[PDB]
Design an enzyme around this catalytic site. Structure first.
Site, short mmCIF file in Angstrom:
data_model
loop_
_atom_site.label_atom_id
_atom_site.label_comp_id
_atom_site.label_asym_id
_atom_site.label_seq_id
_atom_site.Cartn_x
_atom_site.Cartn_y
_atom_site.Cartn_z
CG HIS A 1 33.03 49.89 45.30
ND1 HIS A 1 31.86 50.61 45.30
CD2 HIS A 1 32.80 48.80 44.54
CE1 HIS A 1 30.96 49.99 44.57
NE2 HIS A 1 31.50 48.89 44.09
CB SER B 1 36.39 43.43 40.26
OG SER B 1 35.45 43.48 41.30
CE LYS C 1 28.59 38.83 32.17
NZ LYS C 1 29.68 38.94 31.18
CG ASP C 2 24.95 41.66 38.35
OD1 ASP C 2 25.82 40.90 37.88
OD2 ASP C 2 25.23 42.65 39.05
CD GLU D 1 19.64 21.06 56.56
OE1 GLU D 1 19.67 21.30 55.34
OE2 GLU D 1 18.73 20.41 57.10
C1 HEC Z 1 35.96 33.94 51.80
C2 HEC Z 1 35.74 34.81 50.81
C3 HEC Z 1 34.41 35.56 50.52
C4 HEC Z 1 33.16 35.40 50.98
C5 HEC Z 1 32.54 34.37 51.95
C6 HEC Z 1 32.32 36.40 50.37
N1 HEC Z 1 33.10 37.18 49.55
FE1 HEC Z 1 32.38 38.41 48.11
N2 HEC Z 1 34.26 38.66 47.37
C7 HEC Z 1 35.40 38.06 47.87
C8 HEC Z 1 36.51 38.50 47.06
C9 HEC Z 1 37.98 38.08 47.26
C10 HEC Z 1 36.05 39.32 46.12
C11 HEC Z 1 36.90 40.01 45.04
C12 HEC Z 1 36.88 39.14 43.80
C13 HEC Z 1 37.64 39.76 42.66
O1 HEC Z 1 37.47 40.98 42.42
O2 HEC Z 1 38.42 39.04 42.01
C14 HEC Z 1 34.62 39.44 46.29
C15 HEC Z 1 33.77 40.20 45.52
C16 HEC Z 1 32.46 40.46 45.85
C17 HEC Z 1 31.50 41.25 45.11
C18 HEC Z 1 31.74 41.98 43.77
C19 HEC Z 1 31.19 41.15 42.62
C20 HEC Z 1 31.78 39.77 42.59
O3 HEC Z 1 31.03 38.79 42.82
O4 HEC Z 1 33.00 39.66 42.33
C21 HEC Z 1 30.35 41.25 45.79
C22 HEC Z 1 29.03 41.94 45.43
C23 HEC Z 1 30.53 40.46 46.96
N3 HEC Z 1 31.82 39.99 46.98
C24 HEC Z 1 29.54 40.24 47.89
C25 HEC Z 1 29.55 39.24 48.82
C26 HEC Z 1 28.45 38.89 49.68
C27 HEC Z 1 27.11 39.65 49.63
C28 HEC Z 1 28.85 37.85 50.44
C29 HEC Z 1 28.14 37.03 51.54
C30 HEC Z 1 26.89 37.18 52.00
C31 HEC Z 1 30.21 37.54 50.06
N4 HEC Z 1 30.61 38.40 49.07
C32 HEC Z 1 30.98 36.55 50.59
C33 HEC Z 1 35.46 37.20 48.94
C34 HEC Z 1 34.39 36.69 49.63
C1 LIG Z 2 24.39 16.85 63.55
O1 LIG Z 2 25.05 17.79 64.39
C2 LIG Z 2 25.64 18.84 63.82
C3 LIG Z 2 25.02 20.02 63.62
O2 LIG Z 2 23.74 20.24 63.96
C4 LIG Z 2 22.72 20.10 62.96
C5 LIG Z 2 25.76 21.15 63.00
O3 LIG Z 2 25.22 22.21 62.81
C6 LIG Z 2 27.18 20.98 62.62
C7 LIG Z 2 27.83 22.19 62.01
C8 LIG Z 2 28.37 23.12 63.05
C9 LIG Z 2 29.64 23.50 63.13
C10 LIG Z 2 30.71 23.03 62.19
C11 LIG Z 2 30.08 24.45 64.20
C12 LIG Z 2 29.27 25.75 64.20
C13 LIG Z 2 30.10 26.86 64.74
C14 LIG Z 2 30.13 27.33 65.99
C15 LIG Z 2 31.01 28.46 66.45
C16 LIG Z 2 29.24 26.70 67.03
C17 LIG Z 2 27.99 27.53 67.34
C18 LIG Z 2 28.15 28.25 68.64
C19 LIG Z 2 27.20 28.55 69.52
C20 LIG Z 2 25.76 28.21 69.35
C21 LIG Z 2 27.56 29.28 70.78
C22 LIG Z 2 26.52 30.32 71.22
C23 LIG Z 2 26.60 31.57 70.41
C24 LIG Z 2 25.58 32.13 69.76
C25 LIG Z 2 24.20 31.57 69.76
C26 LIG Z 2 25.77 33.39 68.97
C27 LIG Z 2 27.02 34.19 69.36
C28 LIG Z 2 26.87 35.65 69.04
C29 LIG Z 2 27.66 36.40 68.27
C30 LIG Z 2 28.88 35.88 67.56
C31 LIG Z 2 27.38 37.86 68.05
C32 LIG Z 2 27.80 19.81 62.81
C33 LIG Z 2 29.23 19.58 62.45
C34 LIG Z 2 27.07 18.68 63.43
O4 LIG Z 2 27.61 17.62 63.62
C1 LIG Z 3 32.60 43.18 39.85
O1 LIG Z 3 31.55 44.08 39.56
C2 LIG Z 3 30.54 44.09 40.43
C3 LIG Z 3 29.53 43.20 40.40
O2 LIG Z 3 29.48 42.21 39.49
C4 LIG Z 3 28.93 42.51 38.21
C5 LIG Z 3 28.44 43.25 41.40
O3 LIG Z 3 27.57 42.41 41.31
C6 LIG Z 3 28.45 44.34 42.43
C7 LIG Z 3 27.38 44.47 43.49
C8 LIG Z 3 25.94 44.24 43.17
C9 LIG Z 3 24.96 44.84 43.84
C10 LIG Z 3 25.18 45.83 44.95
C11 LIG Z 3 23.53 44.54 43.49
C12 LIG Z 3 23.10 43.20 44.12
C13 LIG Z 3 22.21 43.39 45.30
C14 LIG Z 3 22.50 43.39 46.60
C15 LIG Z 3 23.87 43.20 47.19
C16 LIG Z 3 21.39 43.59 47.59
C17 LIG Z 3 20.09 42.90 47.14
C18 LIG Z 3 18.90 43.75 47.41
C19 LIG Z 3 17.73 43.73 46.77
C20 LIG Z 3 17.41 42.81 45.62
C21 LIG Z 3 16.62 44.66 47.16
C22 LIG Z 3 16.61 44.99 48.66
C23 LIG Z 3 15.47 45.92 48.97
C24 LIG Z 3 15.26 46.66 50.06
C25 LIG Z 3 14.07 47.55 50.24
C26 LIG Z 3 16.24 46.61 51.21
C27 LIG Z 3 16.80 47.98 51.63
C28 LIG Z 3 16.24 48.44 52.94
C29 LIG Z 3 15.86 49.68 53.29
C30 LIG Z 3 15.98 50.82 52.32
C31 LIG Z 3 15.30 50.06 54.63
C32 LIG Z 3 29.46 45.22 42.45
C33 LIG Z 3 29.57 46.33 43.43
C34 LIG Z 3 30.55 45.15 41.46
O4 LIG Z 3 31.45 45.96 41.48
#
Ligand code: HEC
Ligand SMILES: COC1=C(OC)C(=O)C(C/C=C(\C)CC/C=C(/C)CC/C=C(\C)CC/C=C(\C)CCC=C(C)C)=C(C)C1=O
Ligand SMILES: COC1=C(OC)C(=O)C(C/C=C(\C)CC/C=C(\C)CC/C=C(\C)CC/C=C(/C)CCC=C(C)C)=C(C)C1=O
Ligand SMILES: CCCCCCCCCCCCCCCCCC(=O)OC[C@H](COP(=O)([O-])OCC(O)COP(=O)([O-])OC[C@@H](COC(=O)CCCCCCCCCCCCCCCCC)OC(=O)CCCCCCCCCCCCCCCCC)OC(=O)CCCCCCCCCCCCCCCCC
Ligand SMILES: CCCCCCCCCCCCCCCCCC(=O)OC[C@H](COP(=O)([O-])OCC(O)COP(=O)([O-])OC[C@@H](COC(=O)CCCCCCCCCCCCCCCCC)OC(=O)CCCCCCCCCCCCCCCCC)OC(=O)CCCCCCCCCCCCCCCCC
Ligand SMILES: CCCCCCCCCCCCCCCCCC(=O)O[C@@H](COC(=O)CCCCCCCCCCCCCCC)COP(=O)(O)OCC[N+](C)(C)C
Ligand SMILES: CCCCCCCCCCCCCCCCCC(=O)OC[C@H](COP(=O)(O)O)OC(=O)CCCCCCCCCCCCCCCCC
Ligand code: HEC
Ligand SMILES: [Zn+2]
Lengths: 48, 59, 376, 441, 464, 194
Positions: free
Chosen positions: C201, C205, C227-228, C271
């Site tokens: 923000h 975008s 649209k979303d 997976e």
């Molecule tokens: C490795 C890259 C990557 C990951 C993973 C990623 N984002 Fe994005 N995201 C981006 C980038 C870069 C943009 C900006 C895109 C643009 O404006 O061209 C973006 C844009 C967005 C936007 C604005 C709308 C859109 O889709 O462009 C939202 C919302 C968003 N990200 C949410 C998320 C959420 C929620 C997750 C995961 C739970 C996530 N992103 C994971 C890179 C990432």
């Molecule tokens: C059949 O076999 C296999 C799996 O199994 C079903 C797999 O999934 C994966 C996929 C896993 C990959 C690629 C690696 C995942 C990444 C990391 C860093 C390993 C996970 C690390 C752990 C569990 C260390 C302990 C840490 C924990 C629990 C959390 C740490 C806390 C914070 C960061 C706040 C592969 C390749 C695999 O061949």
């Molecule tokens: C490029 O333009 C853009 C878009 O593309 C058109 C986008 O999409 C978005 C972002 C879209 C948003 C924030 C809406 C999508 C929803 C999200 C990330 C969260 C989903 C939550 C839901 C459905 C409800 C959750 C409900 C509750 C009660 C949880 C909250 C908890 C408490 C209050 C305790 C942005 C900012 C944008 O700029």
């Protein structure tokens, strides 16, 4: 345009690069992390 | 009135990369002294009641 | 204005109602809102699931079965939580590929890309340790194979491994701590998602044309809500199909067997969304080199805003090379589910080499050539 | 460690007098002038100073402006010494700051001057920088557009002084033609200015016969030999609007002027061309010096005046000698009466002591103007541009050889000529204009 | 590439040898009278004008609390009539020699001088001695100047920079003689009289503290004869009441402190930050001169500020942090002041403060050789510009004989400047700046100026 | 107040009227009415109270009305207009004439104002009528029809005036023109009155 674009354009000269003294002062932080890790783990007389 | 020495300032205080390892060695020795004092006081007060006193008594 | 007197309404208005958005965004800009919806769905289904799951060996499998057959709406909740991880990864992968296609991480949106890569790493760890929780054969043996890969770091190996396990093998302490870590990590995901959206923000975008769009901006809350909603309804259709008609299509049948530490299955594969990293690891005939290559992929992902030149259309060579990269990644995904064979080893090595070649050679050098062709 | 010998002690054996003392020249140096084959005149005077000053005088100023190019000289004062065909602005700034040199652009009412001052060891660098910044200047669009703001505050600050405004309106009233144009224009005059306007003005004013290179402390043969390939200029002489003295009277309305300013002026016949008339005008300017601040914190009290400020400008062919006096808003008629009484008492005769004092004041001003190298270079350049020669010795001889009868005759001939009268301020008390210009008749 | 327009000049800073400029520079002759007064001349071969005057090693430092302001009041009184010449007689005689008398009164130095022509050297000597020795000091003129000074004190009629620097001297030199203002307080002016003026002139205006310095067109022997005729009657000095004994008796003290002078509806925000610098006799004063040239100065009427060599000038000009600023290097007999003074407003005051502190601390760590060579060339060129005006030549002669004890030759000054390199700059910056207390003074709209702890924290870096 | 004053001084006719009233008169009639906005900088309500106290006196106040019975108006204005105050001396004015000029550096039109004293003021009915007739005579270009196309050789705009005060007044004409044509504007304005 921060990164490889800076060096493709000729913006990274012999000047604007860090000096030897700057690199030594930054390079002196290598001993600090080693001493901190040895302080945290304490493997006393572990050097072979 | 009381004031830190200049020659002692230029060695252990002017750079953080020299100050931090000195800090860590002082921390190590402070922990050792506190451990020694607490353990000596506890063992002196509770003499004859610990398990090691019974084991050394049975030798 | 009513929103000008309460500071909560001012922030919500500014960032969800009146936020200026380019008017020519197509349907490939709906990945982020879908990813947020999937994160919220996973959190809700899991919090509901944790009221019937017991995180102990000799109770975990039976608690999942009691959840499936005895809890009202429990089968829907479990199948939704299982397939929602797959749909979450589908959406996030398509989001990342969009950003790769358009050069979305470039200046001034490098923080957005970096926070995205951090989110992806936390998502991977969360999904893996959540997959361990049902305590089947695939759960136990995947957790065994992955966590016993810390014996590649010299000297400090099995020490870290035994500290992770809480013992000498994957057992009840490993499952018990994996439950706590898996419950906790999605809240870090939600906070990182909020920070990630807040970083975008600052500058807004990009658009499909790849030009400056400050002259043509419209309100978010009216035009990009419906649209979303359309894309969310498509995702709900796919989700409902997966839950109700093919609930075990994306899984593995071996995870319906209770875990046996003395008998191993014939084929141990993770997976599907972990399969490309598994193929990269399994192709290289050295454990430390495989872990180094896996780390190098993510390092090159972090370095992408500072080395990647070239965006969508009007940059046509990198645009064409994107499809070779997509084919390479999908090939690595296919290879991870196969057996180890000399031809598959050779093909996986070639695919890993081309992945590194595209990420580190094509994106800077071909992009610089495109800039010299277009504006030189 | 660095040097630790304290400055009360002499520095050690690494402090040598290896350069010997060069013998002084036998006589005071004379001004030597010539002309390049392109037509640019070059005049230089040698000095014993270790500072060399190089100045380039171009005919122009407010006298060469048009209604389209109004205020171009003030813009040229700021926009000079920027990006040329051979150097950028950054390179010229760093090349000036490397040798410790300073540059100025200064616009008169009939000329513009560009100059570089440096030490005697960097005279080639100063000459090359000055010639490149004058001849090959680019006047880019964005630099002029960004300089226009600073031009606007410099003009707004210079118009805060009422003496500048009185001088502008006095030059407007005294002359018709080139010399009547406004130098310090209003800030809103240059609101529509662009680099095309400045380029048009520069193309009008630049010509080989209208450019003089003046140097102080530079050998003349070396300067001509190294400036021949640099000052090869081409162009046509844009017509000059020759000015004539007519006189008259005007007014200014100022809403929050705490005082009231009255200007009285006459024409110095002959301009800068006549040595004797300019010397007599300088003597008259010194004779009108009522309160000269020769001592710290001295309080000379006048009955009516708050400030007295005379002047004597000598342009080409004509001049303007006069006096500007302030006063209270309710005593403006008294200010006019006192000024007329002072000029009339000057016409009634000067008495020996006043004549000697004014001659010494004029000689002191003339000799203190050329004491430094940049002042001497500016004086040489202005005198060669206006006349074709530098005659400071002849000006001093004319100042010293002036009798009281000649000065009385000069003031008598001045008061017969029609004067120029300008007022200023929130004018709420004024005698009628017909009786204003009657007391000298 | 232009052939004639691109030779001889390039933007790469290289050291320049100023040795050939020393061959034609004139020589200084010094003669010490039996009074103890030194007569020093410097004859410029074809000069037509002459600057000459009397420089005195005295001022506001050597006063007391009871008579603070007497030396400044003396330059109000001294030109109002002597015992041999009246006001009008002095005015006519000065007007007839075509010059002007002038006077400056510092904390440690005082000068009274005349800028005349070469034919009026003896008349200027006679006039200067007449005001200096035979002044009336009339009580009516004292009353006629007291009320004017009291009106300009009640109006707060002062320059902003002088106001800030007086606050800076008052808070940096607490409880030492250098913390007093030259003007003095209101009560001393309200209770001044002729007796205090007589006692001050009798105590301090003596032979070993006075230099008669003349430059321009002047003969040394004739000035010696004229000074022995005129200034031969000044009292000598007791050994117990010399300048060094007074310096030892009341020494300077530097205290790290903070002051601001807040106004309710002001527009500007003037501020100065200074460190304890070097005395005049410290050999580290030449590197402090080079460092002051390296910091430089800038005001917003210039438009080439973004192409400056100085990084502080570049930062302030590019980001628009201040309307004007300047780096200063003040030297006294036993202490000094080094720092930066600037004018800004309340919304840019913190960023300007950060730029000052960050550029001061940066000189301890990273100093490149090109900046040092550039600053040495600029400082030597600035010294050559002072040789062009005879007023500056006479001022430097008087100052150098008063505070160094001798006339430093130009060859020694060039050699002492040329011995400065980047290691010397780093050492001097480490000695004076790094992790030291500073003095902060501000006036005007100063509600957003950071306090003392913010300034104290930014005198060192935690990252090295 | 300051923005309204700046809006009023943007019209050159208002400025020329102010300079004409100052130049023609000596006394209270020469004081500027539409003052510069910088004059009202240090103004407070005590200054206004001082001015109101200076002008208020029961002999200096006229209550006029239109469309009301006179007896009822006096009966109802009896307990309201109980004014108490001192009749301050009136700074009486005399015509003196003269010549003044005001500089505008970015004005595309040069204005010339000419005026004469209407002797007698508003008390003289015959002199006031003659001044009105002279003002009507000098009005050369009065557009009485839509889109009239009168064209003078030098006069860009001509506005005559006639003011009547207690004891004196002005009648004259203000004519604009090109900045390069001001001498001919003066010539035509002069020849019109002969
Ligand atoms: C490795 C890259 C990557 C990951 C993973 C990623 N984002 Fe994005 N995201 C981006 C980038 C870069 C943009 C900006 C895109 C643009 O404006 O061209 C973006 C844009 C967005 C936007 C604005 C709308 C859109 O889709 O462009 C939202 C919302 C968003 N990200 C949410 C998320 C959420 C929620 C997750 C995961 C739970 C996530 N992103 C994971 C890179 C990432
Ligand atoms: C059949 O076999 C296999 C799996 O199994 C079903 C797999 O999934 C994966 C996929 C896993 C990959 C690629 C690696 C995942 C990444 C990391 C860093 C390993 C996970 C690390 C752990 C569990 C260390 C302990 C840490 C924990 C629990 C959390 C740490 C806390 C914070 C960061 C706040 C592969 C390749 C695999 O061949
Ligand atoms: C490029 O333009 C853009 C878009 O593309 C058109 C986008 O999409 C978005 C972002 C879209 C948003 C924030 C809406 C999508 C929803 C999200 C990330 C969260 C989903 C939550 C839901 C459905 C409800 C959750 C409900 C509750 C009660 C949880 C909250 C908890 C408490 C209050 C305790 C942005 C900012 C944008 O700029
Ligand atoms: C049966 C399948 C075929 C469908 C028929 C297609 C013909 C009509 C297409 C069209 O214009 O439809 C209008 C329109 C599609 O919009 P669009 O303007 O063409 O932009 C989307 C394109 O992908 C335009 O994409 P792009 O221009 O941004 O191209 C870049 C894209 C290239 O995208 C592709 O080539 C398709 C993706 C392949 C994987 O690169 C990628 O692969 C990045 C991944 C992004 C995912 C895209 C979805 O159709 C809809 O309204 C569909 C609604 C979809 C909602 C759900 C979204 C998430 C699930
Ligand atoms: C103790 C060790 C700290 C250390 O190594 O400092 C080196 C490093 C270099 O500092 P420096 O060059 O000596 O002085 C700062 C500059 O003068 C530049 O200072 P500035 O005037 O530009 O303002 C920077 C300011 C403000 O810095 C920021 O941008 C905000 C910092 C946020 C940190 C606080 C978050 C607390 C936990 C919430 C999560 O930083 C501070 O307040 C000081 C350090 C903050 C801790 O100091 C840091 O910035 C500390 C890094 C944070 C980790 C603690
Ligand atoms: C690494 C952690 C910080 C170490 C302490 C440190 O850097 O001190 C801070 C201040 O200290 C703190 O705020 C930290 C105190 C807590 C220390 C905790 C360390 C934890 C170590 C864990 C093992 C690794 C700044 O002082 P220095 O630059 O190092 O000392 C010189 C300062 N001066 C130039 C002004 C004389
Ligand atoms: C379908 C093609 C893949 C396939 O056959 O998989 C086998 C797998 C099943 O294998 P089986 O059990 O042998 O049939 O198919 C799938 O279920 C995969 C479907 C999704 C395809 C992967 C696309 C997203 C992952 C790649 C992006 C990650 C990197 C981003 C940076
Ligand atoms: C990025 C993916 C992801 C997120 C986010 C996520 N989970 Fe899950 N979780 C999984 C996967 C995959 C499984 C394995 C499901 C299976 O195969 O039965 C799982 C399993 C579980 C289980 C074991 C019961 C079962 O049926 O497997 C619980 C309890 C659980 N998750 C709770 C949570 C909670 C609580 C949250 C959030 C606060 C959460 N999950 C968020 C991926 C995720
Ligand atoms: Zn004073």
């Amino acid at each position: 345009p921060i990164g490889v674009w800076s060096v493709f354009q000729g913006y990274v000269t012999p000047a604007r690069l860090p000096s030897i003294q700057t690199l030594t002062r930054v390079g002196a932080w290598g001993g600090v992390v080693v001493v901190g890790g040895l302080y945290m783990v304490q493997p006393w007389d572990w050097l072979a | 009135v009381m004031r830190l020495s200049e020659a002692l300032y230029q060695t252990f205080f002017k750079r953080s990369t020299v100050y931090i390892p000195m800090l860590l060695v002082g921390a190590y020795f402070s922990n050792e002294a506190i451990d020694y004092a607490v353990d000596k006081m506890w063992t002196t007060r509770n003499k004859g009641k610990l398990f090691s006193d019974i084991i050394a008594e049975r030798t | 204005r009513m929103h000008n007197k309460i500071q909560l309404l001012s922030v919500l208005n500014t960032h969800l109602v009146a936020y200026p958005t380019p008017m020519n965004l197509n349907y490939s800009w709906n990945g982020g809102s879908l990813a947020g919806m999937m994160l919220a769905s996973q959190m809700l289904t899991g919090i509901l699931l944790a009221m019937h799951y017991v995180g102990h060996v000799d109770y975990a499998f039976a608690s999942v079965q009691h959840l499936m057959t005895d809890v009202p709406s429990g089968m829907i909740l479990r199948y939704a939580h299982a397939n929602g991880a797959s749909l979450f990864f589908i959406v996030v992968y398509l989001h990342v590929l969009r950003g790769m296609y358009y050069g979305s991480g470039a200046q001034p949106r490098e923080i957005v890309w970096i926070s995205g890569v951090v989110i992806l790493l936390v998502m991977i760890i969360t999904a893996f340790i959540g997959y361990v929780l049902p305590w089947g054969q695939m759960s136990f043996w995947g957790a065994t194979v992955i966590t016993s890969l810390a014996t590649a770091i010299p000297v400090v190996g099995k020490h870290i491994m035994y500290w992770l396990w809480g013992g000498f093998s994957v057992d009840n302490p490993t499952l018990n701590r994996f439950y706590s870590f898996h419950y906790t990590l999605p809240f870090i995901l939600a906070g990182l998602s909020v920070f990630h959206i807040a970083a975008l923000h600052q500058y807004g975008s990009t658009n499909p044309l790849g030009v400056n769009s400050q002259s043509s901006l419209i309100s978010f809350g009216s035009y990009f809500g419906a649209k979303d909603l359309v894309g969310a309804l498509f995702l709900a259709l796919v989700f409902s199909i997966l839950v109700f008609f093919y609930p075990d299509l994306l899984g593995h049948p071996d995870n319906l067997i209770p875990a046996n530490p003395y008998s191993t299955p014939q084929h141990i594969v993770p997976e599907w969304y972990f399969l490309w990293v598994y193929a990269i690891l399994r192709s290289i005939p050295n454990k430390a080199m495989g872990v180094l290559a896996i780390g190098l992929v993510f390092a090159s992902l972090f370095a992408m805003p500072f080395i990647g030149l070239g965006g969508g259309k009007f940059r046509i060579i990198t645009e064409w090379l994107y499809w070779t990269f997509l084919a390479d990644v999908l090939l690595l995904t296919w290879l991870g589910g196969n057996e180890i064979t000399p031809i598959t080893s050779f093909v996986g090595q070639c695919c890993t080499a081309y992945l590194f070649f595209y990420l580190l050679v094509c994106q800077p050098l071909v992009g610089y050539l495109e800039t010299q062709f277009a504006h030189g | 460690g660095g040097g630790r010998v304290e400055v009360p002690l002499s520095e050690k054996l690494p402090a040598v007098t290896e350069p010997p003392r060069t013998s002084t020249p036998a006589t005071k140096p004379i001004v030597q002038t010539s002309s390049l084959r392109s037509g640019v005149k070059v005049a230089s005077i040698n000095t014993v100073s270790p500072i060399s000053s190089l100045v380039l005088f171009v005919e122009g100023g407010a006298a060469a402006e048009t209604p389209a190019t109004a205020g171009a000289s003030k813009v040229l004062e700021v926009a000079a010494f920027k990006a040329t065909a051979n150097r950028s602005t950054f390179r010229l700034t760093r090349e000036l700051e490397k040798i410790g040199a300073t540059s100025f652009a200064r616009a008169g009412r009939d000329h513009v001057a560009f100059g570089v001052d440096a030490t005697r060891l960097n005279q080639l660098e100063a000459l090359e920088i000055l010639a490149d910044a004058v001849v090959n200047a680019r006047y880019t669009y964005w630099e002029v557009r960004d300089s226009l703001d600073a031009v606007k505050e410099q003009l707004a600050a210079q118009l805060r002084n009422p003496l500048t405004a009185v001088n502008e309106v006095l030059h407007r009233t005294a002359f018709e033609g080139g010399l009547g144009h406004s130098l310090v224009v209003d800030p809103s005059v240059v609101d529509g200015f662009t680099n095309e306007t400045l380029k048009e003005y520069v193309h009008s004013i630049m010509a080989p016969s209208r450019v003089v290179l003046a140097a102080s402390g530079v050998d003349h043969a070396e300067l001509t030999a190294l400036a021949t390939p640099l000052l090869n200029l081409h162009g046509n002489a844009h017509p000059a609007p020759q000015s004539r003295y007519v006189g008259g009277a005007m007014n200014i309305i100022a809403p929050t002027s705490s005082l009231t300013y009255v200007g009285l002026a006459f024409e110095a016949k002959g301009g800068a061309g006549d040595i004797k008339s300019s010397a007599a005008a300088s003597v008259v300017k010194a004779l009108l010096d009522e309160a000269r601040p020769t001592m710290p914190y001295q309080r000379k009290e006048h009955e009516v005046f708050t400030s007295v400020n005379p002047f004597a400008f000598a342009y080409k062919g004509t001049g303007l000698v006069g006096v500007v006096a302030s006063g209270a808003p309710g005593k403006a008629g008294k200010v006019v009466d006192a000024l007329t009484a002072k000029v009339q008492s000057l016409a009634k005769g000067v008495t020996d002591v006043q004549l000697a004092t004014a001659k010494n004041m004029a000689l002191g001003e003339l000799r203190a103007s050329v004491a430094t190298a940049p002042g001497l270079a500016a004086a040489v350049g202005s005198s060669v541009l206006a006349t074709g020669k530098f005659s400071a010795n002849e000006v001093a001889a004319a100042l010293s050889g002036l009798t009281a009868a000649d000065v009385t005759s000069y003031v008598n001939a001045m008061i017969k000529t029609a004067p120029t009268f300008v007022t200023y301020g929130n004018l709420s008390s004024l005698p009628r204009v017909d009786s204003i210009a009657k007391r000298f008749a | 590439d232009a052939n004639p327009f691109l030779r001889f000049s390039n933007p790469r800073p290289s050291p320049i040898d100023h040795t050939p400029l020393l061959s034609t520079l004139p020589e200084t002759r010094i003669t010490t009278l039996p009074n103890g007064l030194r007569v020093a001349t410097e004859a410029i071969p074809f000069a037509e004008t002459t600057t000459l005057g009397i420089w005195i090693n005295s001022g506001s430092r050597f006063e007391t609390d009871a008579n603070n302001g007497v030396a400044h009041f003396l330059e109000h009184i001294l030109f109002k009539g002597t015992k041999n010449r009246s006001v009008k007689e002095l005015e006519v005689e000065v007007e007839n020699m075509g010059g002007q008398l002038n006077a400056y009164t510092g904390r440690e130095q005082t000068c009274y001088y005349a800028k005349v022509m070469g034919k009026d050297v003896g008349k200027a000597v006679n006039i200067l001695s007449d005001i200096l020795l035979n002044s009336n000091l009339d009580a009516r003129a004292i009353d006629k100047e007291r009320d004017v000074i009291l009106r300009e004190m009640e109006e707060v009629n002062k320059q902003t920079s002088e106001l800030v620097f007086d606050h800076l001297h008052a808070t940096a030199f607490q409880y030492s003689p250098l913390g007093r203002t030259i003007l003095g307080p209101v009560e001393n002016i309200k209770s001044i009289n002729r007796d205090q003026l007589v006692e001050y002139m009798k105590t301090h205006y003596r032979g070993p503290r006075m230099v008669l310095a003349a430059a321009g067109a002047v003969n040394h022997d004739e000035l010696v004869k004229l000074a022995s005729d005129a200034f031969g009657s000044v009292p000598d000095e007791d050994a117990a009441t010399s300048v060094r004994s007074l310096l030892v008796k009341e020494p300077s003290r530097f205290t790290g402190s903070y002051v601001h002078d807040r106004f309710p509806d002001a527009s500007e925000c003037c501020m100065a930050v200074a460190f304890k610098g070097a005395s005049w006799t410290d050999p580290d004063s030449i590197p402090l001169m080079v460092m002051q040239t390296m910091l430089g100065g800038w005001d917003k009427n210039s438009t080439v500020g973004k192409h400056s060599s100085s990084a502080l000038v570049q930062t302030v000009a590019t980001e628009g942090l201040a309307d004007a600023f300047m780096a200063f290097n003040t030297n006294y007999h036993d202490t000094g002041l080094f720092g930066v003074y600037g004018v800004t407003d309340r919304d840019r005051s913190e960023d300007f403060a950060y730029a000052i502190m960050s550029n001061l601390t940066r000189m301890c760590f990273e100093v490149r050789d090109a900046d040092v060579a550039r600053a040495k060339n600029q400082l030597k060129a600035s010294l050559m510009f002072f040789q062009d005006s005879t007023h500056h030549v006479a001022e430097s002669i008087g100052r150098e004989l008063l505070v160094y004890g001798r006339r430093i030759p130009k060859a020694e000054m060039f050699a002492r400047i040329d011995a400065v390199d980047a290691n010397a700059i780093r050492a001097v910056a480490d000695r004076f700046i790094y992790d030291q207390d500073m003095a902060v003074a501000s006036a005007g709209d100063v509600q957003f100026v950071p306090d003392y702890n913010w300034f104290r924290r930014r005198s060192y870096w935690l990252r090295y």
